[PDB]
C-alpha cells in the first residue's frame, strides 16, 4: 500500500522568468497566483508527513524484543530487525529497500527511514510479545503458544487443535515465510504500487521542466531574446503570452499533484486502518486482512509504502 | 456498578474541562472555516490584477481607447478573470470531494459506534469499546467514544493443559493461571480465580501431546452428592 | 550556531542532544523548539520493555473507563 508521495516544493519566480528582474517587474502584474500554488504544494507536503505519522506512530512505546528468540518453535528472523545491518532493517525490509528504485526542489521527509523502521520493530515486538493487549491498554505479556490458541479460538476452532499440532504449525508458517522471501525476491512486478508512485512523481516533474522550452506561440523562448530583437512595445506582448503560458503549464501541475495526494490520502487512510485492525487486532472480516480466515498480520516498512504480510 | 458510574461521571467532567482548556482542539471546523474564508478572499483580491492590460477597470479602458484595441484589452483582462475563477471552482471540487470522504467516515462512525458496539479495534476509540455518543458542531460532528482500559496487572504463572488421570484438560473460556501454589481458572480480561472443576474444562486426549502440561487435580462437583 | 542538516543548513538555533516531541518541524528528523531557539532530533516515544517468558502470563485486577472526542 503506498502512504506517501515526494513533498516538492516550486519557486513561482524562478521557474517563470528565471533571473530576469524586469520579468518579475511584469509578473508582479498578475497578483497572487504564485502564492496560491505555493500554499497548495505546501498543503500537500504537509499532508504527506500526516499520511505517514498517522500509519506508523500508533504507539508511544518503543518495545524491544527479548534477546532469546525462542517463541516456541515460531522464527520470526526473517521478520525482526538484524542487528549486523548498519541500518538495523529485517532481511525483507531490507529486500524491499533494494527492490524499489530550476525553481523545483524535493524536500526530505520528516520522519528518516530509520525511525519507520524503528516504529515497525516496535509494533512487532508489541505483537509478538503481547498479543492484542498492547493495542488496547498496558501490554501484558502471554507465551507465543497460548497466544496463536487463543487466535484459532477466535476463528471457532478450538485450542486442543493446536496444542496437539504445534509442531506442525510452525513449520507450516516457517515455510511460509520462507516462501514469501522467495516469492517477493523472484518477482519484480509484485512492487508496482510504490514504483508507480515514484515514476508518476518524476515524470510529472520532467514534463514540468520540458515545458521551459516551449514558444506558446512568442517568437523565442528565451526572454532576453525578446529583449534584445524586439522593441518593449510588443516585447511586452512577447513576454505577457510566455508567462501566461508557463503559469498554465504551473497551474496544471499543481492540479494533477492535488488529484494525486487526493488518492494518495485514501490509500494511506486504508493503510492505517489495516494495521490498526489487522496488525493491533485479530479481524473477523472477510478478505480484509487475507484471504482466508484471518490470525494474525506483520508489518514491514517499505519505500514510499508499508507491506503487511497476512 | 457504582464504581463504574463514578469513573464514568468523573470523565465526562473531565471531557468537557479539556475541551474548554485546549484551543486547537477543534482545529478541523476551524480549517474548514478558514479555508473557504481565504478561497473567498483570494478570489476578490485577485480582481485588481491588470493581467498585462493598461488597467484593471474596464470603464476607463472602454472610455480611454478606441473600440479595435479595447477590445483586445478586454480580451486580455476577460480571460485572465475566467482562468481565476475556473481555479477556483476546481479547487472548490477537490475540496468537496475531501469534505465527501470525511462525511462519509463520519456516517459510519455514527452507525457502527452509537448505534451498536464494534469489536473493530481503534475505530470507536482507544480501548475495548462500550459506546459513543454524538454531538453536533458547527460544520461537524463530535464523537464522545466511551471506552473500557484495563490497569493493575498482576504477573501468573500458566500452563497451556492440565494432566489430571491420563486425561488433558483446556479451559473453556478462561485460562489457566497460578498464584505459587494452587492453580485457578480465570476469565481472560479481568483477574476472577475460581477452582478448576468438569464444568469449566473440557477434555481432549491423554496428556502425552501437549507441550508444557503440569500435574493438577480437577474437583467434580458431583462426588461430594454421591459421597452421602 | 551553525548547524548542519539533510535538509540544509539551520542558522540560528543551537542543537542540543535531548530529545523531545516535535514542535516546529524541520525535516529529516530534526525539530525545533523555543524553550532561546533549540533544534534536536525527535524523540519516537518513551522506551519500554516487556518481560517475555514461555510460562508468565499478566491478567489485568482492575479497568478504567475511559472517554475520547472524535471531531
Ligand atoms: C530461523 O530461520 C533462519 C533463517 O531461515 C535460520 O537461519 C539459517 O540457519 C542455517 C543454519 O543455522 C544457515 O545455513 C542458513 O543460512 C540460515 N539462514 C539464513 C537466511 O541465513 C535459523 O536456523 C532458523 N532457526 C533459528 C532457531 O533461528
Ligand atoms: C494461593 O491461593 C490459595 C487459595 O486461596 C491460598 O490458600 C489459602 O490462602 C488463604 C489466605 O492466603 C488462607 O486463609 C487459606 O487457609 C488458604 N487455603 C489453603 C487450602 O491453603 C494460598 O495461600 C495462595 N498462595 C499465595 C502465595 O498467595
Ligand atoms: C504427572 O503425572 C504422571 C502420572 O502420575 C507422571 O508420570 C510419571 O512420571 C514418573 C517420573 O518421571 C515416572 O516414573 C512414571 O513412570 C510416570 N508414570 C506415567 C503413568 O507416565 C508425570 O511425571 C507427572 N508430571 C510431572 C511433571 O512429574
Ligand atoms: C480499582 O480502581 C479503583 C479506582 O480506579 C479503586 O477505587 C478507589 O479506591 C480507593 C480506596 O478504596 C479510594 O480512595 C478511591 O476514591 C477509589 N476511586 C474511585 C474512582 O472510586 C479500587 O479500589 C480498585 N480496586 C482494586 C481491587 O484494586
Ligand atoms: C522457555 O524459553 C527458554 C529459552 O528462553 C527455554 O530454554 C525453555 O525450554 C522454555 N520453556 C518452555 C516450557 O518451553
Not at chain 1, 18 to 36: A, I, M, R, V, W
Not at chain 1, 138 to 166: D, H, K, S
Not at chain 2, 146 to 158: H, I, W
Request: net charge neutral; hydrophobic share 40%; aromatic share 8%.
Amino acid at each position: 500500500l503506498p502512504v506517501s508521495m515526494t513533498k516538492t516544493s516550486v519557486d513561482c519566480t524562478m521557474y517563470i522568468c528565471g533571473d530576469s528582474t524586469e520579468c518579475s517587474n511584469l509578473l508582479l502584474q498578475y497578483g497572487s497566483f504564485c502564492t496560491q500554488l505555493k500554499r497548495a504544494l505546501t498543503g500537500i507536503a504537509v499532508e504527506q508527513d500526516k499520511n505517514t505519522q498517522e500509519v506508523f506512530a500508533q504507539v508511544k512505546q518503543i518495545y524491544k524484543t527479548p534477546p532469546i528468540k525462542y517463541f516456541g518453535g515460531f522464527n520470526f528472523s526473517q521478520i525482526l530487525p538484524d542487528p549486523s545491518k548498519p541500518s538495523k532493517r529485517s532481511p525483507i525490509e531490507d529486500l524491499l529497500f533494494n527492490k524499489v528504485t530550476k525553481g523545483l526542489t524535493v524536500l526530505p521527509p520528516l520522519l528518516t527511514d530509520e525511525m519507520i523502521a524503528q516504529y515497525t520493530s516496535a509494533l512487532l515486538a508489541g505483537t509478538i510479545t503481547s498479543g492484542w493487549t498492547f493495542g488496547a491498554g498496558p501490554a501484558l505479556q502471554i507465551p507465543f503458544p497460548m497466544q496463536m490458541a487463543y487466535r484459532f479460538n477466535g476463528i471457532g476452532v478450538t485450542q486442543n487443535v493446536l496444542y496437539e499440532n504445534q509442531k506442525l504449525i510452525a513449520n507450516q508458517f516457517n515455510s511460509a515465510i520462507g516462501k514469501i522471501q522467495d516469492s517477493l525476491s523472484s518477482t519484480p512486478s509484485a512492487l508496482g504500487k510504490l514504483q508507480d508512485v515514484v515514476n508518476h512523481n518524476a515524470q510529472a516533474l520532467n514534463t514540468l521542466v520540458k515545458q521551459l522550452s516551449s514558444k506558446f506561440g512568442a517568437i523565442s523562448s528565451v526572454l532576453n531574446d525578446i529583449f534584445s530583437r524586439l522593441d518593449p512595445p510588443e516585447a511586452e506582448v512577447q513576454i505577457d503570452r510566455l508567462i501566461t503560458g508557463r503559469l498554465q503549464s504551473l497551474q496544471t501541475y499543481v492540479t494533477q499533484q492535488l488529484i494525486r495526494a487526493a488518492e494518495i490520502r485514501a490509500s494511506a487512510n486504508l493503510a492505517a486502518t489495516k494495521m490498526s485492525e489487522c496488525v493491533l487486532g485479530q479481524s473477523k472480516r472477510v478478505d480484509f486482512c487475507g484471504k482466508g480466515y484471518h490470525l494474525m498480520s506483520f508489518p514491514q516498512s517499505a519505500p514510499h509504502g508499508v507491506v503487511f504480510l497476512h | 456498578q457504582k464504581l463504574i458510574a463514578n469513573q464514568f461521571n468523573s470523565a465526562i467532567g473531565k471531557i468537557q474541562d479539556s475541551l474548554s482548556s485546549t484551543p486547537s482542539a477543534l482545529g478541523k471546523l476551524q480549517d474548514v472555516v478558514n479555508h473557504n474564508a481565504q478561497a473567498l478572499n483570494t478570489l476578490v483580491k485577485q480582481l485588481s490584477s491588470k493581467f498585462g492590460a493598461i488597467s484593471s477597470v474596464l470603464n476607463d479602458i472602454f472610455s480611454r481607447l478606441d473600440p479595435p484595441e479595447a477590445e483586445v484589452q478586454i480580451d486580455r483582462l476577460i480571460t485572465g478573470r475566467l482562468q481565476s475563477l475556473q481555479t477556483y471552482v476546481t479547487q472548490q471540487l477537490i475540496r468537496a470531494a475531501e469534505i465527501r470522504a470525511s462525511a462519509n467516515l463520519a456516517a459510519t462512525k455514527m452507525s457502527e459506534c452509537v448505534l451498536g458496539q464494534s469489536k473493530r479495534v481503534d475505530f470507536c476509540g482507544k480501548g475495548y469499546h462500550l459506546m459513543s455518543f454524538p454531538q453536533s458542531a458547527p460544520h461537524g460532528v463530535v464523537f464522545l467514544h466511551v471506552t473500557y482500559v484495563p490497569a493493575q496487572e498482576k504477573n501468573f504463572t500458566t500452563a497451556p493443559a492440565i494432566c489430571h488421570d491420563g486425561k488433558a484438560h483446556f479451559p473453556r473460556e478462561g485460562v489457566f493461571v497460578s498464584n505459587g501454589t494452587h492453580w485457578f481458572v480465570t476469565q481472560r480480561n479481568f483477574y476472577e480465580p475460581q477452582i478448576i472443576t468438569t464444568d469449566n474444562t473440557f477434555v481432549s486426549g491423554n496428556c502425552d501431546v501437549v507441550i508444557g502440561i503440569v500435574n493438577n487435580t480437577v474437583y467434580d462437583p458431583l462426588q461430594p452428592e454421591l459421597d452421602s | 550556531n551553525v548547524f548542519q542538516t539533510r535538509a540544509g543548513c539551520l542558522i540560528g538555533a543551537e542543537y542540543v542532544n535531548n530529545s523531545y516531541e516535535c514542535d516546529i518541524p524541520i525535516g529529516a528528523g530534526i525539530c525545533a523548539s523555543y524553550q532561546s531557539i533549540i533544534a534536536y532530533t525527535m524523540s519516537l516515544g518513551a522506551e519500554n520493555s516487556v518481560a517475555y517468558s514461555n510460562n508468565s502470563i499478566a491478567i489485568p485486577t482492575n479497568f478504567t473507563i475511559s472517554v475520547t472526542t472524535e471531531i
